[PDB]
Amino acid sequence: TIENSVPVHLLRTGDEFATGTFFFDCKPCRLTHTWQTNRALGLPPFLN
Amino acid sequence: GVGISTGTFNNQTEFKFLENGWVEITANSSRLVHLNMPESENYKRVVVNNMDKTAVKGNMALDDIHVEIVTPWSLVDANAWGVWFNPGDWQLIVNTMSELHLVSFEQEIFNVVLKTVSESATQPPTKVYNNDLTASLMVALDSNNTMPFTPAAMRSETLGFYPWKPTIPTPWRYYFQWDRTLIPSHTGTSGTPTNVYHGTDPDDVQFYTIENSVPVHLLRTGDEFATGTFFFDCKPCRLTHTWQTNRALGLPPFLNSLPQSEGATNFGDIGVQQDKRRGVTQMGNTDYITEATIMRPAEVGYSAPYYSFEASTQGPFKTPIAAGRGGAQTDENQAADGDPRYAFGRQHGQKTTTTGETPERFTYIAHQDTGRYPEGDWIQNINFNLPVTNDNVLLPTDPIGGKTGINYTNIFNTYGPLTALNNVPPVYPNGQIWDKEFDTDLKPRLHINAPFVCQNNCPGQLFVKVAPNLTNQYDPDASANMSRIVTYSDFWWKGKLVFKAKLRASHTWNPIQQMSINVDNQFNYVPNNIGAMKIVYEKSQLAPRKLY
Amino acid sequence: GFYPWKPTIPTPWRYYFQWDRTLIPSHTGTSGTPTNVYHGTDPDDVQFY
Q1: CA–CA separation, B415 vs B321, rounded Å?
Q2: How does DSSP classify residue B192?
Q3: Residue B268 DSSP one-character state
Q4: Is the peptide bond before B429 cis (omega within 30 degrees of 0)?
Q5: Are B386 and B378 in contact (CB under 8 A)?
Q6: With contacts defined as CB-CB under 8 Å, which chain B residues touch C31?
Q7: Are the Cβ atoms of B509 and C14 closer than 8 angstroms?
Q8: Is the separation of the CB atoms in B298 and B418 below 8 Å?
Q9: How many beta-carbon pairs under 8 angstroms link A with B?
Q10: Do B182 and B195 contact (CB within 8 A), yes or no?
Q11: Whole-angstrom distance between the N-terminal and C-terminal Cα of chain C?
């Protein structure tokens, strides 16, 4: 129950509300993709 | 410049004991490398089809189709054990230390020599070797690890394990995105299955170039080059093996009855019933508390599919396994707990004075016991109600999928958040030392080819090449091929690898398994009348360690 | 003992020693004698505390 478990704000026209700034905790997101399997790993054979 | 020497030779193994049982080992390997002129001074892109072995409808693990790009650049790998220690040093480490910490690594190249070959077509004809004192060598270092990583241990394209023996770098090459499809097929599967090489995904096209992406150094005789010191980041390597399963964990039963005399047939009997024994089990059905039933804190090692030849966009590939042993001696599943296999020749083991061209190998079998005998398991009913009945138990012998050869053992994967594990021990010589780490957000717990993985930073690849020596005729407006002066160059390479370890104390009463020289070993560690040398493989972790 | 006003007893100490074995499953029907033996001990894994 929201009424029971959280502070409620009544805003009228003249009012306004603002959350402050929240900082997240998260590992970065990469904008790259891996195209390597198990057959594209290491030193390929030597072509005689 | 050209008179004078640039470096010194040192292939010495130094051990410096510190305080509180810590030693600081520094292995030096100064080998003299030889290198010839790259045939093409151009980069290639070659495709390999062997669509004549992958048609026999039986042959699917023999898929040698990949795509590589050849580089005129010749690489140099020293990421091996055999290249550092000798059978006499390894004994010291392995018999007396208990853990190893890889530290520093620094390479140094000196006494560069470049000679031209003059072919005097006269009778024989004859060959006249000279020195082109103005010639050059193109040394390069990928200090910012920008290029792929090709550990040349995998394919025994390392450096000689005998210092007094001149060696050769490996022609550099790397992978290029090759796309394929190949469906399995036994000897009977009717029709033509499916297998093709579409080509390349335009997305995954990475065409590297050393000239473009790395600072190149030209060294003349008078010059020299030195990498500085690189520090690794790696968890220590243990020189101990675990011999404890799930039946050798905790407080054994209390034997109400003990033998009253000698005989390997006088067993101490507990003296209580299985369905009236006190303790804890992970069952809510039974009342039977057995050495197989009782609840153990966790599970040692895991059980995975064998010969689970998976596949993706590049083609089928086997499923790795981190295993130890798992059976009576010469009573193992060589493939169930994944036992490495090593093939080298002449320059990395094997009898120097051999003939023909056939690699020699060994199937290294550790000492740790985390492996399994997938030939003594079973899946039965929640009803238990033993003695278990056929229709109530799936055994190894019982086929799955209707085919004989197959099992549930073959398709089985018991890896739980309760799986305990020990990394892959060093396999010396041959075996690898340290191996880069995957750039995937999620990373493998441990590598199967090397005990040390450097995470945040690894030393860069040393690419060694010969500079084009040109004649009086050269038209860059001619395909031909920059006919050049047949040039090669010989240079001395030196290495300083640093390891820091701790010493083993005794805690038992029974001696521990050590390394020695038998009447069977002797001549495996000494040259012969002709000078036939060779380096045998030898178990690393041979010393107990209590798991729990 | 879980009852304080009740005198208790320690447990005779004992621990494991490397024992090597083989045992293959077998239902009530599996024909013949399957396989099960106790070779002994691997000389490598001998810890006598």
Answers
A1: 12
A2: -
A3: P
A4: yes
A5: no
A6: none
A7: no
A8: yes
A9: 68
A10: yes
A11: 29
Please state, in angstroms and rounded to a whole number, the distance separating the CA atoms of residues B242 and B262: 30
The nearest alpha carbon in chain A to B63 belongs to A39
Give the integer Cα–Cα distance in Å for B436 and B415: 26
Contact flag A40-B175 (C-beta cutoff 8 Å): yes
Asked whether residue B144 is marked as a ligand-binding residue, the answer is yes
Range 4-43 of C in CB contact (< 8 A) with B:
11-12, 14-16, 18-20, 22-30, 39, 42-43
Cα(C18)–Cα(B369) distance, integer angstroms: 11
Q: Taking Cα atoms as reference points, which of B25, B344, B35, B347 lies closest to residue B161?
A: B347
| B49-58 long-range contacts, CB within 8 A, separation 24+ | B49/B197, B51/B195, B54/B182, B54/B195, B55/B195, B57/B185, B57/B186, B57/B187, B57/B188, B57/B189, B57/B193, B58/B185, B58/B186, B58/B187
Say if residues B45 and B302 touch (Cβ distance below 8 Å).
Answer: no
Concatenating the DSSP letter of every residue in B460-486 gives PPEEEEEPP-B-S---TT--S---B--
**Rounded Cα gap, residues B14 and B2, in angstroms:** 32
Q: Shortest Cα distance from A22 to chain B (angstroms)?
A: 25
Q: What is the DSSP letter of B253?
A: P
The reply to whether residue B312 touches residue A37, judged by beta carbons under 8 angstroms, is: yes
HEC assignment per residue over B381-410: CCCCCCCCCHHHEECCCCCCCCCCCCCCCC
Distance from CA of A24 to the nearest CA of B (A): 19
Query: Would the CB atoms of B441 and A41 count as touching at under 8 Å?
Result: no
Question: Does B546 lie at the interface with C, CB-CB under 8 angstroms?
Answer: yes
Helix (H/G/I), strand (E/B), else coil: A20: coil
Cα dihedral sign, B438-B443-B447-B450: positive
Contact B183, B195 (CB under 8 A): yes
Report cis status (omega within 30 of 0) of the bond before B125.
yes
Which residue of chain B has the CA closest to C26?
B395
The experimental resolution of this structure, in angstroms, equals 3.3
| Selected residues 371-390 of chain B with any CB under 8 Å from a CB in chain C | 373, 375-378, 387-390
Task: Report the alpha-carbon distance of residue B360 to residue B537 in Å, rounded.
Answer: 11
Ordered domains of chain B (ranges, CATH): 1-548 (2.170.30.10)
Is B205 in the C-facing interface, judged by CB distances under 8 Å? no
Amino acid letter, residue B408: Y
User: Cα dist. B100→A23, B229, B233, B525 in Å?
Assistant: 42, 19, 13, 25
Q: Determine the Cα–Cα distance for residues A12 and B46; give it in Å rounded to an integer.
A: 73
Determine whether A29 is exposed, middle or buried from the number of CB atoms within 10 Å of its CB (0-12, 13-18, 19+): exposed
